[PDB]
Write a protein that binds this ligand. Structure first.
Ligand SMILES: Cc1cc2nc3c(=O)[nH]c(=O)nc-3n(C[C@H](O)[C@H](O)[C@H](O)COP(=O)(O)O)c2cc1C
Ligand code: SF4
Lengths: 102, 66, 28, 427
């Protein structure tokens, strides 16, 4: 795997279902005001859910919602694991292999 | 105009003496008797820098992705 | 068990019943 | 320690498991006396746990009793929160998620009854999103009670009540530290801060927080509900209580059991239920901690009680509260590399000792196991491990070497002969 994008879907395009703009009212409701500025962890992942893997125009979209310069997103999606930047299948299966599982 | 070495007169041109201080700096220009000039030493502001002010409630200084 | 559909979980009882928030500002 | 046990009765600190999963009046145990507790002065709860003095389940010492009556004594301008790990970082831990799976009604109380001591404002929990199904249900458990009016904003009978906001991670180790979790609760990348800013109770979300653990805030209400004088039951004058162990990797029926302190490993492993591998002649090479403690051979471990400071007597102690063992076929050198190959993937990567310093080992560990170039390396590889201690910020480095530090201890030859096994082979 490599962490650079070869201009796949700069304009995919992508958008959220108008059923989802009523939840993002609730998420931001969690946090205090003025620091809000990152709900990114659910909000960026909810977008994975609506789609099933998020292209680069998904990473650019939430920035327009969250007003953070979108290297403060492309970063967070390349740190964690659960998000899948490339495409996937209908079932993405795991085999735990570790000292006990070994 | 044979190679491009830059040949020169001005037989001093390369000397740097090293003194220990100003009071004893000008000491050697007069005593040998030529004109001169002076610059001044510089050292920074005090200054005030504190990590741990980088995470702030109402302050405007709050870093991200450090 | 519900693969998609976090909705009412997030937006039904939570949306109305998460008061206020005040949360202040932080304008900044 | 008394009778060298650690028994298990129906008198324990956990109410029920197979009885009732859903909501209700907390038919017998829970939500019993509340308005009397909270209405009395808050510091009555503070130091009232000292009758027990819980060391804490966060994988360390530092009894939970101090840090809450610790700073966060005053209050000035800015709210205080609660962040209680639900996460599991250590391989084979598994103690967590059993508390939540069949009995969530306990912990929402555990905060509310607990949070009053902090004088806190809100309640955050945190859960690795890798548990989608079980973690999804807490919200119901929140609602199925909270909706009844049991919590917030006065509930019940006080002027102080506040709700709990679940969150989730993804590829986290982040519970691997406080002062990381409070960072990735925020939405930055998670690189844990420096430990002494202002340690974790000054620099925080916007404002002071305290990072608790699961059964540190789980068992607090029931230990403030009854307490005693039974709060100190088993274990010596130092460590006292009954925690949960979860056995894994060789047994008849590896499964959790509530067991009090100072229990020897030779009766405990064999019990609950059997020893199904060789109870002896299977060589019983054991790991006290989950990933945080190196091996013990057949020596005094089997008589060594599981009391904390009893383990510091051996070359390593364990706060993780887990057990992994081995018998015969498992090649330890083969079975410890995939404990190290794990570390290389879970590390932040800020610090120069951790990053670029763990791989130097992990790249060589695939020499020994395979069998490959000559000894005198072992003598160096020990020094590397001796060279990362005060040099890293978080504990993940201090938890990086011990497995290798304590492999070179306790087994000399198994390596020495294998480097020959390929040496004679080359010939
Ligand atoms: C690799 C690693 C993984 C960890 N995983 C967890 C975890 O899953 N849950 C947890 O509560 N603490 C975990 N910690 C340790 C945190 O320091 C701990 O949660 C925090 O100190 C809270 O301690 P306390 O609430 O018991 O006082 C982990 C530490 C490391 C180094
Ligand atoms: S060890 Fe160094 S790099 Fe790995 S996580 Fe702790 S700090 Fe970040």
């Amino acid at each position: 795997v490599h962490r650079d994008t070869p201009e796949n879907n700069p304009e995919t395009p992508f958008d959220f279902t108008p059923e989802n703009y009523k939840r993002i009212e609730a998420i931001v409701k969690n946090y205090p005001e003025g620091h809000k500025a990152a709900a990114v962890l659910p909000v960026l992942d909810l977008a994975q859910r609506q789609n099933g893997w998020l292209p680069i125009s998904a990473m650019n979209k939430v920035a327009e919602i969250l007003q953070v310069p979108p290297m403060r997103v492309y970063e967070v999606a390349t740190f964690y694991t659960m998000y899948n930047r490339k495409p996937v299948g209908k079932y993405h299966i795991q085999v735990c292999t570790t000292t006990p599982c070994m | 105009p044979l190679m491009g070495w830059a040949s020169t007169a001005d037989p001093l041109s390369n000397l740097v003496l090293t003194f220990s201080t100003k009071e004893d700096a000008v000491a050697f220009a007069e005593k040998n008797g030529w004109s001169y000039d002076v610059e001044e030493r510089k050292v920074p502001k005090p200054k005030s820098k504190s990590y741990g002010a980088n995470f702030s409630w109402n302050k405007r200084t709050r870093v991200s992705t450090k | 068990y519900s693969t998609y559909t976090f909705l009412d979980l997030n937006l039904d009882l939570s949306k109305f019943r998460m008061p206020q928030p005040s949360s202040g500002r932080e304008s900044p | 320690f008394g009778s060298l046990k650690d028994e298990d009765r129906i008198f324990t600190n956990l109410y029920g498991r197979h009885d009732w999963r859903l909501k209700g009046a907390q038919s017998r145990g829970d939500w019993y006396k509340t308005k009397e507790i909270l209405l009395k002065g808050p510091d009555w709860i503070l130091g009232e746990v000292k009758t027990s003095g819980l060391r804490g389940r966060g994988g360390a010492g530092f009894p939970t009793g101090l840090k809450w009556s610790f700073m966060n004594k005053p209050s000035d301008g800015r709210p205080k929160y609660l962040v209680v790990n639900a996460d599991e970082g250590e391989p084979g831990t598994c103690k967590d998620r059993e508390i939540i799976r069949h009995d969530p009604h306990k912990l929402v109380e555990g905060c509310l009854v607990g949070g009053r001591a902090m004088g806190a404002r809100a309640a955050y929990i945190y859960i690795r999103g890798e548990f989608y199904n079980e973690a999804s249900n807490l919200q119901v458990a929140i609602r199925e009670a909270y909706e009844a009016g049991l919590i917030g904003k006065n509930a019940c009978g006080s002027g102080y009540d506040f709700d709990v906001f679940v969150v989730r991670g993804a590829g986290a180790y982040i519970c691997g530290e406080e002062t990381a979790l409070i960072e990735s609760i925020e939405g930055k990348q998670g690189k844990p801060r420096l430990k002494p800013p202002f340690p974790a109770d000054v620099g925080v979300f916007g404002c002071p927080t305290t990072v608790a653990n699961v059964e540190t805030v789980a068992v607090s209400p029931t230990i403030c509900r009854r307490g005693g004088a039974w709060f100190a039951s088993f274990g010596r004058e130092r460590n006292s209580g009954t925690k949960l162990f979860n056995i894994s990797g060789h047994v008849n029926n590896p499964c959790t059991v509530e067991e009090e302190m100072s229990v020897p490993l030779k009766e405990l492993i064999e019990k609950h239920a059997g020893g199904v591998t060789g109870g002896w002649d299977n060589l019983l090479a054991v790991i006290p901690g989950g990933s945080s403690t190196p091996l013990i051979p057949k020596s005094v471990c089997e008589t060594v009680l599981m009391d904390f400071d009893a383990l510091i007597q051996a070359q390593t102690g364990l706060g993780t509260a887990a057990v992994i063992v081995m018998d015969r076929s498992t090649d330890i050198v083969k079975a410890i590399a995939r404990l190290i190959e794990f570390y290389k993937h879970e590390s932040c990567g800020q610090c120069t000792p951790c990053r670029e310093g763990v791989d130097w080992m992990n790249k060589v560990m695939a020499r020994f196991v395979r069998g490959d170039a000559r000894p005198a390396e072992i003598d160096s590889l020990w020094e590397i491990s001796k060279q990362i201690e005060g040099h890293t910020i978080c504990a993940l480095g201090d938890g990086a070497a011990w497995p290798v530090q304590g492999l070179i201890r306790h087994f000399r030859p198994e390596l020495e002969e294998r480097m020959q096994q390929f040496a004679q082979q080359h010939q």
